[PDB]
Amino acid sequence: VQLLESGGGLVQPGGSLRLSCAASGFTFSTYAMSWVRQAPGKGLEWVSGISGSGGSTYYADSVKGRFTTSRDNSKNTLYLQMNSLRAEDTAVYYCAKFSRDYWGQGTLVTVSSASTKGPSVFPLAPSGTAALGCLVKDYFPEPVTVSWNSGALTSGVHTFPAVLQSSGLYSLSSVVTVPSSSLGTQTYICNVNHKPSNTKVDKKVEPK
């Protein structure tokens, strides 16, 4: 079983957004499906549930009249249509199947009057191992992904959770520990992706 959410992003207060959840590995129409959300630093909150095949739908009081759940039992897809969004609807949204239960991976919905901003990416150093990295500075909204050498380098990688600065912009860093003996000759590139701004940066990190 896999549940894969998509469609999260930044929306102005009063705006609209539709989430989708692609289900696979089970007869979708047999099971009631649910949406659950989690605001930053808070607990899991039920949003909506829909019967197998769609004839009955239930909503938390906090979203009634603004959110509409639906499903496509041939494409095996669950939907959440949001209108009249509010700042307090900002959360990670999960699709889930509760009878074994299954959870999706979540998609972030940010409701804010702040504008999208792509990051600036700066290389970090290196000085029998050496630490080198990339600084992903001043972006909004979350999330950013970082890989190294297009995924060929995973050992010793540590991408840190972002800081939320007083400006309202995020920054994060990713560091990789490598053999000092490789610094002259092995190329290290951090691949930074900020999908909300269509930003894709490949930064080569050179010794000094």
Binding site: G43, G49, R100, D101, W103, F122, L124, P161, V163, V175
Partner: protein, 213 residues
């Protein structure tokens, strides 16, 4: 209508057992309850179900040291042979007439783990950022346990407060914790001191890294 309440925190020692409690409000003493685990920075994972019978099923890949039970309006999750991986949040959940209900979650701390001192790496501003007339010092703090640190910055030997942004600790996949701290400076401020320092205090001991223009 139906409410589930949980105590906000629980603890037990490495290798020992712990029992978490989920209490049903009155009027529903016959509903199935499911337990979900959530690690720092991850999505929830389903553990198992418990019906008001004491029997339980389990999810895929969940070890046998997880089990469930019930007594009256209380539903239980028991974790035996506690490991560092079990330090996490636990939510109970049920369903009733199209409505889903969650407890508020219990944060489990696994006691008796060894203290682990932070690894600190401090980077100066890059050449590229300086040419953009900005400067950021980057202090990366990893592999510490327990998961609480205090970060202080020094310009030479004087404390710096302005321009400091520090994250909350988050648990790594290796069950130790990470945090980061950023100091924003002008290029002039950076070049006008002999050094800057990032000082990480953990469990009564402070370690320092220093960089210089």
């Amino acid at each position: 209508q139906l409410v589930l309440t949980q105590s906000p925190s629980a603890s037990a020692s490495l290798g020992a057992s712990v029992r978490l409690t989920c209490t049903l409000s009155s009027g529903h003493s016959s509903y199935v309850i499911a337990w979900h685990q959530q690690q720092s920075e991850k999505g929830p994972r389903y553990l198992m179900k418990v019906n008001s019978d004491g029997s339980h099923s389990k999810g895929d890949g969940i070890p046998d040291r997880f089990s469930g039970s019930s007594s009256g309006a209380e539903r239980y999750l028991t974790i035996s042979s506690l490991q560092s991986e079990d330090e996490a949040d636990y939510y109970c959940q049920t369903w009733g007439a199209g409505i889903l209900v969650f407890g508020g979650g219990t944060k489990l701390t696994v006691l008796s783990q060894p203290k682990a001192a932070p690894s600190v790496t401090l980077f100066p501003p890059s050449s590229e950022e300086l040419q953009a007339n900005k400067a950021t010092l980057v202090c990366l703090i990893s592999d510490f346990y327990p998961g609480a640190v205090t970060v202080a910055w020094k310009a030479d030997s004087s404390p710096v407060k302005a321009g400091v942004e520090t994250t909350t600790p988050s648990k790594q996949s290796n069950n130790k914790y990470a945090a980061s701290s950023y100091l924003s400076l002008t290029p002039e401020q950076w070049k006008s001191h002999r050094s800057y320092s990032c000082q990480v205090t953990h469990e009564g001991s402070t370690v320092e890294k220093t960089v210089a223009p």
